[PDB]
Amino acid sequence: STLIEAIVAREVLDSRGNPTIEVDVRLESGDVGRAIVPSGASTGAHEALELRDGDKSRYNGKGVLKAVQAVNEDIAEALIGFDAADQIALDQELIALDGTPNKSKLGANAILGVSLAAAKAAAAAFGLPLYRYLGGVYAHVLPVPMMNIMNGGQHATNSTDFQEFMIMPVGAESFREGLRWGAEIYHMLKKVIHDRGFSTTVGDEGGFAPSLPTNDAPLQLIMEAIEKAGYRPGEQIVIALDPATTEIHLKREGRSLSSAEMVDYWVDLVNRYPIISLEDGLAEDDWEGWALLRAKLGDRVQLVGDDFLVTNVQRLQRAIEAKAANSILIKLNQIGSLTETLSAIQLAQRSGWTAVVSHRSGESEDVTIADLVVATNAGQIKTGAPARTDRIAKYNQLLRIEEELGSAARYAGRSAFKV
Amino acid sequence: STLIEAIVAREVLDSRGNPTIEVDVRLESGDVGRAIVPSGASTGAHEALELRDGDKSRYNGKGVLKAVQAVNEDIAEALIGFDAADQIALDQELIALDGTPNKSKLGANAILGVSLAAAKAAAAAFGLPLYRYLGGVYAHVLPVPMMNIMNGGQHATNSTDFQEFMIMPVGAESFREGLRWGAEIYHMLKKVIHDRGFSTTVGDEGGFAPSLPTNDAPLQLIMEAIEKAGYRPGEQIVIALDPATTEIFDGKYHLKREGRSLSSAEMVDYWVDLVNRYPIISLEDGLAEDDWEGWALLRAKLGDRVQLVGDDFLVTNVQRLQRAIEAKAANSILIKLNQIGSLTETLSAIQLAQRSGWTAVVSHRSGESEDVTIADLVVATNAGQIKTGAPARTDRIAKYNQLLRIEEELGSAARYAGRSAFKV
Ligand SMILES: O=C(O)[C@@H](CO)OP(=O)(O)O
Ligand SMILES: O=C(O)[C@@H](CO)OP(=O)(O)O
Ligand SMILES: [Mg+2]
Ligand SMILES: [Mg+2]
């Protein structure tokens, strides 16, 4: 009944127009689970690896026909007859079939698609919504969203060294209210940024990327857009940053350097502005800097390891022991399977850290991360600006989940933060 | 078993981040149909009217709680127990329950939401895909897409006048190939534009909106992008345009970056000349909203070799369409599901144009969603053409993805419209 009958994959397009894999897993019950796999950066590196074609006569080598073939043949022959209700066993069967430590044989994209589609197929067989099937009876916490509003850096026309500037509606009584708050402030930002010498176009996440005079100015625009929309900073709306320092050395504020100096810069911002979170505040492998950044403001700021931890258990366990950070950014496709993602979410959580579930550049109509964040009571999500279906779909799923929980639903609010 | 047991609505967000209505229709079988309504007015008019809250303390008055209540209360009470498999009768029930000729009491958005969700609930009950449930056994034609790749006029800081420039992969053997062709060209145009000093922007469709100097420049940049991508203009790729001349119309039209005006007859001559210079197969709103005299003349001069699509001119209005059919005003109509307000009436407008030799072009709206109904509607009615924008934002791409799934599912039965979509 929950035993796999057929596993089918196809090549579809992501939110950038780039090819991506969609996997359909059909059970004996006749229930089908469908999943679209994201894609972003960077690699090859040492995150799980996606199987791309390299055929220059199709989509400039970005085709995923080999990953589709690894599902329709290799994964399908090996998993037909497997019980889809047994997620942990299915994922270790996928990892076993691949044999490589970074999913390079079958592809991280082929493995994750099956991994996620099998969970959805089974959830529909038990007639359960995904968050409930994944996290059990206690899955009820709606996350405070990290809503992108302003960009910066490479796209691009030139902006402050910084990369992403996000808002967080902590003070809201529900996700529905918090969503309205950020959407209002996103539109109110344009009633300040527009008619001043800028466009209304968007990027890959829906946010904007204008030109700025100083590094202190984007914060001043956001803080104005908050009270202009009628919201109180700190108490209701709080700032979350992703400077993504790995790509850069402030070029140019006049001060470029130094691992110890950089930590001192962030301490000033938090003292005058309501910053609750800082993501990739130091480089990919600058382990010495992270430890200092933690000891300085870790008890008043959230420090998120994105490129620093790359959704890896080995370096997450290393940063837990070293006390290098207090938050990890969870990218489903960076690890390659559901079980391994759930494993990394729990490890961070049970070490007093927070798991921030995130989307990527190449998104889809797929809303798994909205059900994964409620299933694990993660308390936070990073799924982009309130402006593109690749991002809005996730916010809509959170609205459906909140409504479906009824009186059981609880919005994380300030309780999402471990200060 | 296909009898409606529950009808519930909620306020979700569209691709612009504005509130929109989502309707769920649950049948006695336990099957649920879900539909999101795309947006959407509230360019009076002669169309169906959507219900917005006007409460400025929520989403700047753009809330949709009133339309949600008209569903959760008025429509649910009236339609619980109605057979969802009877589409026409259901839509007649929604139209009668409203009582207004423009769906202003309940809201066009509440009516469309239920009309669409009931069809999906029913398709799931018969265990059929939507296109099959809607158009029957002969629903198999995959459309040639009108892919938005360049933007101008309004969304133009100051350069350019017209509004949108699209490419159509007429020469492809399948929708899968045609979508790749357009994707490759759009990306090649992203290279061409950056290798000129501009950036890679994307208004709500996904198309690039640069500040250009001449009216020909967007068409030239497109010809270069088609060629550098490795495709042949005319034979493989054709240009479809929506200048939306209502936006630049005392008068006789006004071309800001060309320093001209002239007569509707001269504005026709402008299109006659441009069509001789570029592989333009289709032109949408070549003349303004109510220039019925101009439209009739534009048909006489180009209607034998160019598709003339009425959008703001016909506004998915069956009375205006019947007038234009007789008056010989156009030869194609842009079909907006939410401008008419119901599925039955959309099917009626598509059929009226189809019989009588016109083409029905199914279109998306500026504020779209994850909802992919128009992909199933274009196949169900074998329309042959779709207008779903650039191959970029998921609001657009979701529809392309649904068409890929439809083409795969049909297998040997699937047929891409190709050049047969046209009357050139
Ligand atoms: O940092 C992130 O969360 C994402 C942005 O969507 O980056 P990328 O997808 O490029 O890894
Ligand atoms: O015509 C269209 O395709 C869209 C995009 O501009 O406009 P509207 O909002 O009128 O649907
Ligand atoms: Mg990051
Ligand atoms: Mg138009």
Side-chain angles (χ1 to χ4, degrees), chain B residues 163-164 242-244 284-285 309-312 334 336 363 387:
Chain B
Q163 213 154 272
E164 38 190 298
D242 171 22
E284 182 194 318
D285 288 338
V309 192
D311 180 18
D312 301 321
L334 200 74
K336 290 154 164 182
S363 186
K387 189 178 153 167

Side-chain angles (χ1 to χ4, degrees), chain A residues 8-18 22 24 34 36 56-60 62 65 155-157 176-177 179-181 183-184 186-188 191 198-203 205-206 231 363-367 386-397 399-400 403, chain B residues 8-18 22 24 34 36 56-60 62 65 155 157 176-177 179-181 183-184 186-188 190-191 199-204 207 209 231 368-372 391-402 404-405 408:
Chain A
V8 155
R10 67 189 56 85
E11 174 189 75
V12 293
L13 295 187
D14 67 20
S15 66
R16 289 192 90 251
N18 289 318
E22 181 176 82
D24 294 4
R34 185 167 281 165
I36 310 164
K56 299 275 132 187
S57 73
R58 283 191 96 259
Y59 288 108
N60 290 259
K62 304 173 197 158
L65 299 183
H155 226 59
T157 59
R176 189 175 178 190
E177 292 306 286
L179 184 54
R180 181 171 61 73
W181 290 12
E184 277 177 15
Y186 179 84
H187 290 298
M188 184 42 71
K191 289 133 197 171
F198 307 96
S199 210
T200 359
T201 262
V202 294
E205 293 177 350
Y231 297 99
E363 256 320 317
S364 47
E365 54 267 45
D366 185 277
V367 289
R388 278 165 101 222
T389 298
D390 61 356
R391 302 288 182 268
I392 283 290
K394 277 80 154 162
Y395 289 123
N396 292 336
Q397 187 69 357
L399 290 169
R400 294 183 203 100
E403 178 198 316
Chain B
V8 62
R10 70 192 56 83
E11 178 191 64
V12 291
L13 292 176
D14 61 37
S15 65
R16 280 176 176 269
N18 296 308
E22 188 172 77
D24 293 1
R34 182 167 279 163
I36 317 171
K56 307 198 178 187
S57 72
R58 295 192 80 259
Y59 292 102
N60 288 272
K62 302 170 200 166
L65 304 179
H155 338 105
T157 285
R176 194 179 187 256
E177 298 309 297
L179 170 65
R180 180 174 57 80
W181 287 10
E184 288 181 19
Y186 172 84
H187 293 308
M188 183 54 75
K190 195 182 131 189
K191 284 187 186 179
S199 142
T200 59
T201 66
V202 302
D204 319 331
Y231 298 100
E368 263 309 313
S369 67
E370 45 272 39
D371 182 290
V372 295
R393 294 183 181 277
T394 283
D395 62 355
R396 300 288 182 268
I397 284 288
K399 279 74 142 172
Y400 290 129
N401 289 346
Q402 185 70 352
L404 292 170
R405 292 184 209 99
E408 169 187 330

Side-chain angles (χ1 to χ4, degrees), chain B residues 320-331:
Chain B
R320 289 189 70 99
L321 171 64
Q322 191 49 68
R323 185 182 158 178
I325 289 162
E326 293 161 56
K328 293 179 179 179
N331 58 24

Side-chain angles (χ1 to χ4, degrees), chain B residues 50-376:
Chain B
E50 62 162 350
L51 221 74
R52 295 267 165 170
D53 293 338
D55 181 337
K56 307 198 178 187
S57 72
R58 295 192 80 259
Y59 292 102
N60 288 272
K62 302 170 200 166
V64 63
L65 304 179
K66 280 168 181 184
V68 161
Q69 193 186 85
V71 180
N72 289 343
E73 278 165 35
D74 304 70
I75 295 153
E77 284 148 30
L79 285 178
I80 286 155
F82 204 94
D83 201 316
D86 303 330
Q87 194 63 51
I88 298 163
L90 186 130
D91 291 337
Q92 279 173 175
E93 199 63 19
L94 288 166
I95 287 157
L97 183 68
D98 177 80
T100 84
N102 64 346
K103 303 182 177 68
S104 51
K105 190 204 187 308
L106 292 183
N109 61 330
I111 290 167
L112 192 70
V114 184
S115 183
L116 291 185
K120 292 194 219 185
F126 291 104
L128 287 182
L130 193 60
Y131 68 89
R132 174 51 191 273
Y133 176 79
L134 296 180
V137 127
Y138 200 54
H140 71 285
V141 178
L142 278 102
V144 182
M146 295 195 172
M147 305 168 89
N148 176 256
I149 57 167
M150 194 98 73
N151 289 323
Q154 185 172 308
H155 338 105
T157 285
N158 237 273
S159 295
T160 189
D161 284 310
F162 301 128
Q163 213 154 272
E164 38 190 298
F165 299 76
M166 295 161 294
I167 58 142
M168 307 193 65
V170 284
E173 59 156 52
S174 84
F175 175 85
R176 194 179 187 256
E177 298 309 297
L179 170 65
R180 180 174 57 80
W181 287 10
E184 288 181 19
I185 297 162
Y186 172 84
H187 293 308
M188 183 54 75
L189 186 65
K190 195 182 131 189
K191 284 187 186 179
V192 166
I193 269 147
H194 172 260
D195 303 357
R196 298 292 180 85
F198 310 92
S199 142
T200 59
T201 66
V202 302
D204 319 331
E205 329 282 295
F208 319 112
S211 297
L212 295 328
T214 64
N215 272 146
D216 289 345
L219 297 154
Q220 294 188 110
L221 287 167
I222 282 157
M223 292 293 283
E224 187 192 18
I226 295 167
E227 276 141 12
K228 284 180 163 63
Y231 298 100
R232 306 177 289 260
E235 203 217 302
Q236 291 180 323
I237 314 297
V238 292
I239 302 168
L241 302 173
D242 171 22
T245 62
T246 318
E247 294 289 318
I248 57 130
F249 177 80
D250 289 345
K252 266 339 133 168
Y253 295 93
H254 318 116
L255 299 171
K256 257 177 178 276
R257 296 286 293 172
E258 229 184 58
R260 300 175 72 188
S261 278
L262 295 174
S263 295
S264 290
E266 277 266 45
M267 183 50 147
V268 163
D269 300 325
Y270 183 80
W271 300 130
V272 182
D273 184 40
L274 195 68
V275 151
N276 296 318
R277 302 211 310 284
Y278 299 97
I280 294 148
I281 198 136
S282 177
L283 171 83
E284 182 194 318
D285 288 338
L287 297 145
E289 247 175 57
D290 275 294
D291 184 10
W292 287 83
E293 307 266 53
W295 273 95
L297 180 83
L298 187 67
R299 178 157 189 189
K301 227 160 170 75
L302 289 155
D304 56 272
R305 68 204 193 93
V306 173
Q307 182 178 81
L308 306 162
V309 192
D311 180 18
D312 301 321
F313 176 54
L314 294 164
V315 70
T316 324
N317 190 279
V318 291
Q319 176 202 242
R320 289 189 70 99
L321 171 64
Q322 191 49 68
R323 185 182 158 178
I325 289 162
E326 293 161 56
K328 293 179 179 179
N331 58 24
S332 185
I333 182 189
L334 200 74
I335 297 286
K336 290 154 164 182
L337 205 54
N338 77 308
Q339 269 182 337
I340 192 150
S342 73
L343 181 54
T344 293
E345 295 177 289
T346 298
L347 293 173
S348 183
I350 288 157
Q351 191 156 284
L352 190 64
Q354 283 177 338
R355 319 295 183 81
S356 64
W358 284 37
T359 64
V361 185
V362 174
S363 186
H364 60 285
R365 295 287 267 164
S366 61
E368 263 309 313
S369 67
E370 45 272 39
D371 182 290
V372 295
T373 308
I374 64 169
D376 289 87

